[PDB]
Design a protein around this ligand. Structure first.
Ligand SMILES: *[C@@H]1O[C@H](CO)[C@@H](O[C@@H]2O[C@H](CO)[C@@H](O)[C@H](O)[C@H]2NC(C)=O)[C@H](O)[C@H]1NC(C)=O
Ligand SMILES: *[C@@H]1O[C@H](CO)[C@@H](O[C@@H]2O[C@H](CO)[C@@H](O)[C@H](O)[C@H]2NC(C)=O)[C@H](O)[C@H]1NC(C)=O
Ligand SMILES: *[C@@H]1O[C@H](CO)[C@@H](O[C@@H]2O[C@H](CO)[C@@H](O)[C@H](O)[C@H]2NC(C)=O)[C@H](O)[C@H]1NC(C)=O
Ligand SMILES: *[C@@H]1O[C@H](CO)[C@@H](O[C@@H]2O[C@H](CO)[C@@H](O)[C@H](O)[C@H]2NC(C)=O)[C@H](O)[C@H]1NC(C)=O
Ligand SMILES: *[C@@H]1O[C@H](CO)[C@@H](O[C@H]2O[C@H](CO)[C@@H](O)[C@H](O)[C@H]2NC(C)=O)[C@H](O)[C@H]1NC(C)=O
Ligand SMILES: *[C@@H]1O[C@H](CO)[C@@H](O[C@H]2O[C@H](CO)[C@@H](O)[C@H](O)[C@H]2NC(C)=O)[C@H](O)[C@H]1NC(C)=O
Ligand SMILES: *[C@@H]1O[C@H](CO)[C@@H](O[C@H]2O[C@H](CO)[C@@H](O)[C@H](O)[C@H]2NC(C)=O)[C@H](O)[C@H]1NC(C)=O
Ligand SMILES: *[C@@H]1O[C@H](CO)[C@@H](O)[C@H](O)[C@H]1NC(C)=O
Ligand SMILES: *[C@@H]1O[C@H](CO)[C@@H](O)[C@H](O)[C@H]1NC(C)=O
Ligand SMILES: *[C@@H]1O[C@H](CO)[C@@H](O)[C@H](O)[C@H]1NC(C)=O
Ligand SMILES: *[C@@H]1O[C@H](CO)[C@@H](O)[C@H](O)[C@H]1NC(C)=O
Ligand SMILES: [Ca+2]
Ligand SMILES: [Ca+2]
Ligand SMILES: [Ca+2]
Ligand SMILES: [Ca+2]
Ligand SMILES: [Ca+2]
Ligand SMILES: [Ca+2]
Lengths: 927, 539
């Protein structure tokens, strides 16, 4: 969380050479000193006829800053014939990508143009170069025989590179095939031990590579960015590559394996044109060894309070579950237009807390598009979404934006100390910077005053000037501080003691030090060892009664403490920093004996009761719950009186009830310090004697489900008194209940069919819908709305069917949406009528013969419904244009349901039922 | 006391359908100014009206893809300009007209590299020679000579590229930030028709080509009229396109071929106020496409803010139909050119800060006229004061675009979106971002879902009994037009054959049986074919 920013290493390069576009740490196993690798595409070189071939500079940490080039290739453009080069190195952007194992470094040139061996051409296939101190070999996995865009001609491999644990360089070419892109992983000592300076192809032995996909997959840009880690079983790392144009500009992120190169897990952006995949990274952010993927979408647009879209970008941070699945989260940028996940760079431990950090970067953030670097830290819970620091760039702008943070690397420690480091690259001002992490001192304090309770008429310590024996009380402060790297031996702290801090500028400060009178004593200590609390004590007294009114407002002692510099390394000292989550403030309370007489000490009688009202929390939703507490002190005084409400997991504290007049507005406040959740309330420091409190505490219990059956809270008061400091703990369980308001909506599509029917012929033996009648479609929906979800229910539907052995509303079939299955006691669509191919009015079962469709439902949560879609069609024999009055019919449909089973078991269930009917009136309209 | 005031200051009144306004300096927004002196923690209310003034001058810039595929296109478009004017004339007096051409960044991987030099000039393989690579050329600024358009265009020649996706976003940007060259009238309705058949390069795609400098958003053209930084500056981000589109009040229309349609809609869904129209293979369909969008352009009044001190917050309660209101919204749709609407805003600062003129504006998207509001402030252990969640102290003063006791609630309606645009599908009300359906037996984020709800043949009934019978409700609430947006028509006896729509039937007050049909295709159709002469009881 804390690197040095007072004085970081300022490395520079030439004007316009994009010095810093790519960075890395060089750590040769053949030597003791580490270095800096800085890509510099667009850098003129001494290669004949080659303009801006770019280069790579090796920069020395040895405080000198002299960092000039790396001897890669000094040969200009090769030839295929007399006046016709075979390759074109001018403007190759060599340096854009720079990785390096140890002693092994791979630099590439993604814009390296090649003439085919075939016809005259200038295709951008790109090449890499792998140096090894002495031996330098060219690595062009795309300079294959096959050319043109339909092949690997515009591959631009080397666009991104990366080494695996067992040395196996992963590589990308966004233009392979039709810009689909492709990954190529080749073993190192295969790449070396196969290099023949006289061939432009080179079949590689154990080569892993992706194939040409289908047409629709063009312009996806696979291999745009690449990272490597283990996402499958054990062993070797797998290939993680970001495809910013996958899908429909949505962007995807593929993870192939390092052995088969077969596809594994995929990731997809949620918004178009956001470049989900511009950058990626695999690192374990929560100490449990399982690589975690991080994917950048620098152009993402979220929503501001105003509701409008802002271009700020998000960083999808997917955690790896041991089950093979993921627990993805998200993290949005801060300012608009500063790309945010524009460059993810996982570090190690800028704190050594046992969890890895990571630095996301907005190259256009901060004032004047100077770019900043937010350095998020890690925790077992996942990644802490709050920038523990922000590396603000400091370079103007000369021709274009500085792009500080556009490229960055950090994970190896360049200096002495046991903490990592970071290299950032601002190529708009042509420079790269080294940020040295500082030592993290964690320090425990500890302070307590001797007599805690003060007797005014106490005679023990003679005053300074005079000899007027006065009421003594001593207080000793102490502290230990152990580091974790290059720093120890002299952790020197400037401590401060203060008496009666509650006393403002009023000056009724009734506590001072012995040999010197004032509520303020100054002092500086020292320490070093792990468990060596180097201490000290001081004599303090209390002013006379005849010079101050009090009535008990605890005489609090105070302690402040801070480190000092010249506590670091030789090569320009690195001042440590105390861990962010440790306070340089500790303070205890001193009281005065008052009313604690007769027996001489306060022994309170304590009690808290609860009525247990509104005992009912329906499983499912946010159930509001208030607790009426009755804090009571019946004994003598009771210092630091306080209520300890122990709430459950699915608890959550809101506040104290003010809306109600008759209640107490306690100074309550939720807390979790230890593996315990609890509401803590101030019940009046000296809770007097016979004092009675009765406040209310509101919450909102969250469902769990088969949590057995009841949710309990635990009440107990406590205090700093020596005798009877607490009260008998009172527990209170609130009972979980079940409520699931299920309802059954129903509706006929053509609810009203006017019977004179537009041109219809009476067929002898029908074959199609047009031959029978108009469609009539009944729709039935069972919907559970109640908080509590159910696990099993039954749907019974009675359909008309016939009447006097005469059909009415012939069913063609039915469909289902949701967890439900059905069965018609009779065969549906006997006459197998396919599509086109080219007793009054009411007819509602009991009157007619039924076709009963029974259905089995099971699992309708809070807001889910199950639907039956029946598709029938009037037989049109609802005619009889003669005898009585064939006028007015109803064709009633009816469907009931019954909830038979829920997930909860120990709670009292009740069967839920009801029904609904659906009519379709076929009337004679003109007559 | 120290009363808070909202003294209106300047206020020409809406120019009742007077686009050509003879020295009446045409105004669409009611009070062109105003001023409020807010005391600490106090708010103040004020109305604001805006009108779609009839006969408003249109400016239309024709930006077409100049790829080989736009061969047939450039044929049945030369005749346009003239053909265009006649239709647009029945909608405007002063019609400006311009043109522009683009293809893709004339560079390395996009351009036809430099294989033989016999390529920096043509489409060599296929013998059909063409023009070289350009990216964004500006030929013909917006002028009166709707015929002179036919000139330049007939004189336009095609080109060819390797990469499927073209480099248009680059053009769409220049043909906006470059007002002077393009010639955009201040008081006029700016349009930018974007025609194409292929995908497109978004920002960051240009890294391949070796371009790492991001679009600055400035105007980059020279005397010659070709986008100069095309080869040195990456494609503009969907957002920068937005920022600049609103700022120059230019209307982007996406006239594209069906093959790549659905893609350009989501690009629209990200660029608010953008219109998409299905273009044709041969591209003849183009004008009947433009003159359709204009309608869409002038049928909405999305009210947009600009600047505005963080301290004061605006709350709106729009109203765009017979004084029935709709609290919360600040925009309106379904309006015909000429109608007027009002909004009613409310400034309110959370503890007056330090002085200055502090002047912010208010105006509808696309309009030039706006309400400039200059604000001034007359005011010269713990804190259980909360439960948090943006909630401050004192006793819980919520923040801008946050309401409710706990500061739980929002002021956002975007959440309560919908496909048809209408708030909560028109079956529910937006409550703290989330809709709360006025349940007709429905559910869903925006109450979209309602399988139990009555077939359309029961929803449209009220429409044909209105726009074709002058009866029933809506005829009663005066909301028969703005509401029944549908375009009815009397079917010559029998109706349609196309089995991609539904046919209804019903009995009217008159006890007669009406038979109609609900259809909908190509570019958002919804005709209500009504069989003429319903079957009534003979006698
Ligand atoms: C590298 O040297 C070249 C030439 O000396 C510089 O520019 C090239 O040549 C002219 C010189 O002004 C430029 O106009 C061209 O743009 C360059 N060549 C090409 C093919 O574009 C170039 O500026 C120098 N580079 C650096 C980083 O200093
Ligand atoms: C991850 O995404 C890729 C691309 O969408 C999937 O790979 C495609 O799978 C189909 C299925 O047969 C193949 O025919 C295509 O050739 C593949 N395309 C490419 C570009 O590789 C892959 O299956 C997806 N899912 C997983 C789990 O990898
Ligand atoms: C001592 O008093 C407190 C103890 O930390 C400090 O006041 C703030 O305490 C809160 C804890 O809720 C922190 O979040 C703030 O950051 C603290 N304030 C500041 C300025 O950091 C106070 O800083 C301490 N002062 C000293 C000299 O020890
Ligand atoms: C079909 O007709 C029946 C009755 O003929 C309708 O059912 C009810 O009928 C009584 C007649 O006394 C009315 O008072 C009720 O209001 C009717 N119920 C409803 C819900 O309207 C039935 O409604 C008709 N079918 C449809 C789809 O409306
Ligand atoms: C059946 O449906 C609902 C319960 O979800 C209730 O319906 C009754 O309640 C109201 C009575 O005026 C109305 O909403 C309904 O029309 C009415 N229906 C009937 C038939 O009276 C009712 O409580 C439920 N009944 C059961 C047994 O669950
Ligand atoms: C935020 O809004 C909710 C909206 O109701 C409020 O809390 C409610 O919680 C339930 C719904 O979520 C309701 O059934 C309760 O009646 C209501 N409870 C309370 C204490 O208001 C409340 O304003 C906010 N939520 C919380 C936990 O305060
Ligand atoms: C209801 O709509 C269908 C089309 O959606 C109408 O069918 C039309 O097309 C059929 C074959 O394509 C023809 O057989 C029909 O004659 C034709 N309709 C007309 C009016 O020409 C169908 O006819 C409509 N219903 C009725 C009663 O006309
Ligand atoms: C590799 O083999 C095939 C794909 O090549 C696949 O079935 C298998 O799961 C992969 N992993 C291992 C360990 O074989
Ligand atoms: C005097 O100091 C304290 C505080 O007044 C008092 O309680 C006690 O009797 C004396 N000190 C000791 C050590 O007894
Ligand atoms: C754009 O919108 C469509 C609408 O169906 C949806 O599938 C998705 O959001 C996007 N689809 C495509 C092809 O872009
Ligand atoms: C919205 O509701 C009405 C509409 O005019 C009015 O009270 C005001 O504009 C808004 N509400 C408040 C409290 O101001
Ligand atoms: Ca593996
Ligand atoms: Ca993990
Ligand atoms: Ca860490
Ligand atoms: Ca270090
Ligand atoms: Ca006592
Ligand atoms: Ca065409």
């Amino acid at each position: 969380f804390n690197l040095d920013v007072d004085s970081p290493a300022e490395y520079s390069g030439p004007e316009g050479s994009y010095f810093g576009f790519a960075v890395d740490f060089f750590v040769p196993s053949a030597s003791s000193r580490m270095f800096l690798l800085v890509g510099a595409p667009k850098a003129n070189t001494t290669q004949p006829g080659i303009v801006e071939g770019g280069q790579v500079l090796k920069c020395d940490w040895s405080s000198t800053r002299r960092c000039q080039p790396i001897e890669f290739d000094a040969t200009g453009n090769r030839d295929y014939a007399k006046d016709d080069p075979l390759e074109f190195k001018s403007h190759q952007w060599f340096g854009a990508s720079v990785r390096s194992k140890q002693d092994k470094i791979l630099a590439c040139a993604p814009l390296y143009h090649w003439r085919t061996e075939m016809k005259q051409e200038r295709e951008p296939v790109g090449t890499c170069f792998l140096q090894d101190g002495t031996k330098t070999v060219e690595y062009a996995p795309c300079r294959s025989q096959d050319i043109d865009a339909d092949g690997q001609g515009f591959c631009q491999g080397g666009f991104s590179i990366d080494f695996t644990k067992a040395d196996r360089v992963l590589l990308g070419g966004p233009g392979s095939f039709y810009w689909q892109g492709q990954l190529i992983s080749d073993q190192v000592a295969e790449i070396v031990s196969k290099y023949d300076p006289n061939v432009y192809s080179i079949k590689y032995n154990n080569q892993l590579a992706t194939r040409t996909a289908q047409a629709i997959f063009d312009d996806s840009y696979l291999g745009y960015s690449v990272a490597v880690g283990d996402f499958n079983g054990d062993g070797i790392d797998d290939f993680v590559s970001g495809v910013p144009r996958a899908a429909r500009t949505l962007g995807m992120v593929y993870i192939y394996d390092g052995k088969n190169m077969s596809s594994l897990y995929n990731f997809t952006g949620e918004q178009m044109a956001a470049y989900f995949g511009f950058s990626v990274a695999a690192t374990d952010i929560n100490g449990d060894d399982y690589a975690d993927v991080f994917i950048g979408a620098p152009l993402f647009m979220d929503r501001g309070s105003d509701g409008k879209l802002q271009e700020v970008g998000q960083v999808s941070v997917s955690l790896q579950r041991a089950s093979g699945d993921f627990q993805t989260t998200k993290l949005n940028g801060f300012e608009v237009f500063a790309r945010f996940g524009s460059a993810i760079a996982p570090l190690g431990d800028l704190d050594q807390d046992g969890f890895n950090d990571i630095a996301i970067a907005a190259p256009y953030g901060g004032e004047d598009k100077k770019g900043i670097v937010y350095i998020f830290n890690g925790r077992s819970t996942g990644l802490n979404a709050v920038p523990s620091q922000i590396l603000e760039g400091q370079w103007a702008a000369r021709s274009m934006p500085p792009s500080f943070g556009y490229s960055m690397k950090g994970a190896t420690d360049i200096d002495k100390n046991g903490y990592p480091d970071l290299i950032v690259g601002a190529f708009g001002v042509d420079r790269a910077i080294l940020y040295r992490a500082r030592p993290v001192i964690t320090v425990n304090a500890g302070l307590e005053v001797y007599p805690s309770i003060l007797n005014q008429d106490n005679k023990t310590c003679s005053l300074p000037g005079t000899a007027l024996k006065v009421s003594c009380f001593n207080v000793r402060f102490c502290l230990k501080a152990d580091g974790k790297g290059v720093l120890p031996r002299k952790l020197n702290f400037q401590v401060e003691l203060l008496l009666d801090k509650l006393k403002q500028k009023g000056a009724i400060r009734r506590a001072l030090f012995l040999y010197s009178r004032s509520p303020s004593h100054s002092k500086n200590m020292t320490i070093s060892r792990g468990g060596l609390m180097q201490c000290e004590e001081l004599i303090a007294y209390l002013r006379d009664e005849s010079e101050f009114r009090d009535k008990l407002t605890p005489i609090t002692i105070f302690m402040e403490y801070r480190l000092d510099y010249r506590t670091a390394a030789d090569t320009t000292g690195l001042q440590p920093i105390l861990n962010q989550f440790t306070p340089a403030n500790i303070s205890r309370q001193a009281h005065i004996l008052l009313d604690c007489g007769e027996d001489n000490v306060c022994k309170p009688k304590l009690e808290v009761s609860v009525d247990s009202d509104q005992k009912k929390i329906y499983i499912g939703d946010d159930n509001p719950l208030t607790l009426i507490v009755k804090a009571q002190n019946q004994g003598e005084g009771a210092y630091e009186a306080e209520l300890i409400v122990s709430i459950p997991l699915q608890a959550d504290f809101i506040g104290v009830v003010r809306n109600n007049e008759a209640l107490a507005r306690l100074s309550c406040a939720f807390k979790t310090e230890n593996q315990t959740r609890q509401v803590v309330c101030d019940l009046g420091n000296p809770m007097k004697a016979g004092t009675q409190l009765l406040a209310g505490l509101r919450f909102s219990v969250h469902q769990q489900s088969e949590m057995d059956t009841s949710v309990k809270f635990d009440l107990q008061i406590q205090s700093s008194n020596l005798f009877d400091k607490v009260s008998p703990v009172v527990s209170h369980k609130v009972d979980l209940a079940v409520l699931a308001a299920v309802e059954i909506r129903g509706v006929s599509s053509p609810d009203h069919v006017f019977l004179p029917i537009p041109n219809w012929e009476h067929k002898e033996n029908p074959e199609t819908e047009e031959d029978v009648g108009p469609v009539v479609q009944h729709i039935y929906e069972l919907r559970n709305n109640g908080p509590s979800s159910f696990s099993k229910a039954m749907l019974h539907l009675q359909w008309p069917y016939k009447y006097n052995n005469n059909t009415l509303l012939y069913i063609l079939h039915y469909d289902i949406d949701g967890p439900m299955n059905c069965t018609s006691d009779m065969e549906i669509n006997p006459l197998r009528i396919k599509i086109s191919s080219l007793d009054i009015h009411t007819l509602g079962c009991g009157v007619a013969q039924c076709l009963k469709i029974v259905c089995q439902v099971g699992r309708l949560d809070r807001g889910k419904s199950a639907i039956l879609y029946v598709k029938s069609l009037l037989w049109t024999e609802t005619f009889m244009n003669k005898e009585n009055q064939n006028h007015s019919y109803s064709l009633k449909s009816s469907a009931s349901f019954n909830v038979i089973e829920f997930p909860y078991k120990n709670l009292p269930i009740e069967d839920i039922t009801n029904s609904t009917l659906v009519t379709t009136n076929v009337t004679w309209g003109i007559q | 006391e120290f009363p808070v005031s909202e003294a209106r200051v300047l206020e020409d009144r809406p120019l009742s359908d007077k686009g050509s306004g003879d020295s009446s300096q045409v105004t669409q927004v009611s009070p062109q100014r105003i001023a409020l002196r807010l005391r600490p923690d106090d708010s103040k209310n004020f109305s604001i009206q805006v009108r779609q003034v009839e006969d408003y001058p249109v400016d239309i810039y024709y930006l077409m893809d100049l790829s080989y595929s736009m061969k047939d296109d450039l044929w049945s478009i030369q005749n346009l300009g003239t053909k265009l004017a006649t239709q647009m004339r029945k909608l405007t007096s002063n019609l400006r007209i311009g043109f522009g051409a683009f293809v893709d960044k004339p560079v390395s991987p996009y351009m036809y590299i430099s294989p033989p030099e016999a390529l920096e000039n043509p489409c060599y393989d296929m013998k059909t020679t063409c023009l070289p690579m350009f990216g964004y050329k500006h030929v013909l600024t917006l002028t009166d000579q709707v015929t002179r358009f036919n000139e330049e265009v007939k004189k336009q020649s095609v080109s060819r590229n390797r990469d499927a996706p073209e480099g248009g976003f680059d053009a769409i940007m220049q043909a906006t930030v470059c007002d002077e060259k393009i010639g955009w009238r201040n008081d006029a309705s700016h349009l930018l028709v974007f025609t194409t058949d292929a995908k497109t390069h978004i920002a960051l795609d240009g890294r391949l080509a070796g371009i790492v400098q991001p679009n600055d958003g400035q105007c980059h053209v020279g005397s010659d009229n070709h986008y100069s930084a095309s080869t040195t500056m990456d494609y503009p981000s969907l957002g920068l396109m937005t920022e600049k589109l609103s700022q120059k009040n230019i209307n982007l229309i996406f006239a594209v071929t069906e093959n790549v349609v659905n893609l350009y809609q989501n690009y629209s869904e990200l660029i608010p106020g953008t219109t998409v129209g299905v273009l044709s293979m041969d591209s003849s369909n183009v004008l009947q496409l433009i003159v359709d969008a204009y309608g869409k352009i002038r049928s909405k009044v999305e009210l947009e803010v600009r600047d505005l001190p963080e301290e004061l917050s605006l709350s709106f309660n729009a109203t765009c139909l017979n004084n029935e209101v709709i609290p919360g919204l600040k925009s309106c749709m379904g309006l015909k050119i000429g109608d007027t609407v009002s909004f009613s805003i409310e400034a309110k600062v959370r503890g007056c800060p330090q002085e200055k003129e502090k002047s912010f504006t208010i105006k509808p998207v696309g309009f030039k006229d706006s309400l400039i509001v200059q604000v001034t402030f007359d005011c010269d252990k713990g804190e259980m004061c909360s439960g948090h969640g943006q909630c401050s102290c004192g006793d819980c003063l919520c923040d801008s675009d946050w309401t409710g006791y706990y500061c739980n609630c929002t002021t956002r309606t975007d959440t309560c979106m919908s496909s048809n645009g209408l708030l909560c599908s028109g079956r529910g009300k937006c409550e703290c971002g989330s809709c709360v359906c006025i349940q007709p037996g429905s559910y869903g984020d925006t109450c979209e879902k309602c399988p139990t709800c009555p077939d359309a043949c029961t929803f449209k009934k009220e429409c044909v009994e209105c726009k074709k019978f002058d009866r029933e409700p809506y005829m009663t609430e005066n909301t028969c037009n703005r509401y029944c947006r549908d375009e009815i028509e009397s079917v010559k006896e029998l109706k349609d054959t196309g089995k991609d729509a539904v046919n209804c039937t019903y009995k009217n007050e008159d006890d007669c049986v009406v038979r109609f049909q609900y259809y909908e295709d190509s570019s958002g159709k919804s005709i209500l074919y009504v069989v003429e002469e319903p079957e009534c009881p003979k006698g």
